[PDB]
């Protein structure tokens, strides 16, 4: 009928970059903590 309520307007696609960065930090924290939980250090 009408009233599309807009759509393609920032924020929108920017989420992509943020998602990649956030995930990277989230994974790195999970993998690093899990790998370190076993006292497995590369150097001290």
């Amino acid at each position: 009928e009408g009233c599309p309520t807009n759509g393609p307007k920032i924020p929108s696609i920017a989420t992509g970059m943020v998602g990649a960065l956030l995930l990277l930090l989230v994974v790195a924290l999970g993998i690093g903590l899990f790998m370190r939980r076993r006292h497995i250090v590369r150097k001290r």
Binding site: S12, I13, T15, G16, V18, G19, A20, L23, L24, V27
Partner: protein, 44 residues
């Protein structure tokens, strides 16, 4: 300030993830070979 909330554009979540995995792969081989060279010569 941060970007307003959202609840659409499922194609954004995919691109983000793809970047996370692709980034880890590249950085993994890059960082690994970057440190290895410091250890000893592997390329003959």
């Amino acid at each position: 300030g941060c970007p307003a909330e959202q609840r659409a554009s499922p194609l954004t979540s995919i691109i983000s993830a793809v970047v996370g995995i692709l980034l880890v792969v590249v950085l993994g081989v890059v960082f690994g070979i970057l440190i290895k060279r410091r250890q000893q010569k592997i390329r003959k």
